Design a protein around this ligand. Structure first.
Ligand code: AMP
Lengths: 18, 345
């Protein structure tokens, strides 16, 4: 599912600027 | 047509009043922009309470008044070593010149031999990010209440020729009335025409930033689309293990929506998350009005939002309590380094 894919991305925490 | 006479007259009058407000707001901004305030407090005016690469953010208490503040502490030698002089000066210059109910207020600023200090009003609800991950997702009315505040804030900022460039839930604080406070102007720039810097956060980057084009304020309207999607879905529209895979999705012109999104919401997002700049809402002849007059915002009373008279959908637990923030190790603060560079601060 999309939600599972989001968890799998490893990018569920705070995101830094580039 | 869609509107009868009464509705059309009311909308036209409302839009003309916005123009009148923005013209005065620009005059006030420009006076402060051209003559910034400096050195309006000192460090021993405050008790350090708790810590919340350039420096630290601390909860502090004003000794005389008892009010709490969030004090941003920047180490000057470290700003200069990381090549952040212009961004630091510009952020403080912007903050002391703007005035809007959904923009954090710089209450004092000063410097000493070692550090720069920006004393901001303390926003005790913490960041939207934590609340969104905890709750999972916001219902559409809840999302819309926040979205409306960002629309009005970008309408304000863009009228001053300020591009914001780092919209994300991490940068949105929730105050005691449940309203938003935009923080962190480190990537904001006064830009009449185009600008070229690669900056932002990967999930929120507009395609024209990824594709190394010159770009304009429309990148903020793309980012609003990403924000509304993430608030309503609980995850952003474009994600992957690594940034480069995120960028491939951003530029593809394809976006998929959860089945619980309303058709009105999908239509708005397709017009904000529009790769073709000649078609993107916020970037057309009718400007911000294409967004404000969209069906998804039909129930939004823009003046009541601005006046903070709408009952918020969520009030953070009101415990100067640090209930809505994390914990960190408390290093000391020691104190004339880098004088010339920060004369303007
Ligand atoms: N005005 C404020 N009130 C409360 N907390 C803040 C404030 N400014 C910054 N913070 C905290 O410090 C972090 C850094 O924010 P910033 O560096 O301004 O993007 C935020 O995510 C909050 O946790």
């Amino acid at each position: 599912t999309t939600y599972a894919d989001f968890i799998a991305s490893g990018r569920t925490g705070s995101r830094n600027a580039i | 047509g869609h509107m009868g006479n009464a509705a059309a007259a009311k909308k036209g009058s409302e839009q003309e009043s916005v123009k009148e407000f923005l013209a005065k707001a620009k005059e006030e901004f420009l006076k402060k922009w051209e003559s910034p305030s400096q050195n309006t407090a000192q460090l021993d005016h405050f008790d350090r309470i708790k810590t919340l690469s350039f420096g630290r953010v601390m909860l502090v208490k004003h000794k005389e008044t008892g009010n709490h503040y969030a004090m941003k502490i920047l180490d000057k030698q470290k700003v200069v070593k990381l090549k952040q002089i212009e961004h630091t000066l510009n952020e403080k210059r912007i903050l002391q010149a703007v005035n809007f109910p959904f923009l954090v207020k710089l209450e004092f600023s000063f410097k000493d031999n070692s550090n720069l200090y920006m004393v901001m009003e303390y926003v005790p609800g913490g960041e939207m990010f934590s609340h969104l991950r905890r709750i999972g997702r916001f219902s559409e009315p809840h999302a819309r209440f926040y979205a409306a505040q960002i629309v009005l804030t970008f309408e304000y900022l863009h009228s001053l020729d300020l591009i914001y460039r780092d919209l994300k839930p991490e940068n949105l604080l929730i105050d005691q009335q449940g309203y938003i406070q935009v923080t962190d102007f480190g990537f904001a720039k006064r830009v009449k025409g185009r600008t070229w810097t690669l900056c932002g956060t990967p999930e929120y980057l507009a395609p024209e930033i990824i594709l190394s084009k010159g770009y304009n304020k429309a990148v903020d309207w793309w980012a609003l689309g990403v924000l509304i999607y993430e608030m309503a879905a609980g995850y952003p529209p474009f994600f992957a293990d690594q940034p480069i895979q995120i960028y491939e999705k951003i530029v593809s012109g394809k976006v998929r929506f959860p089945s619980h999104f309303s058709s009105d919401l999908k239509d708005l997002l397709r017009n904000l998350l529009q790769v073709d700049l000649t078609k993107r809402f916020g970037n057309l002849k009718n400007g911000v009005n294409d967004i404000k007059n969209h069906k998804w915002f039909a129930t939004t009373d823009w003046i009541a939002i601005y006046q903070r008279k709408v009952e918020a959908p969520f009030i953070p637990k009101f415990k100067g309590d640090t209930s809505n923030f994390d914990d960190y190790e408390e290093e000391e603060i020691r104190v004339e380094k880098c004088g010339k560079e920060f004369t303007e601060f």
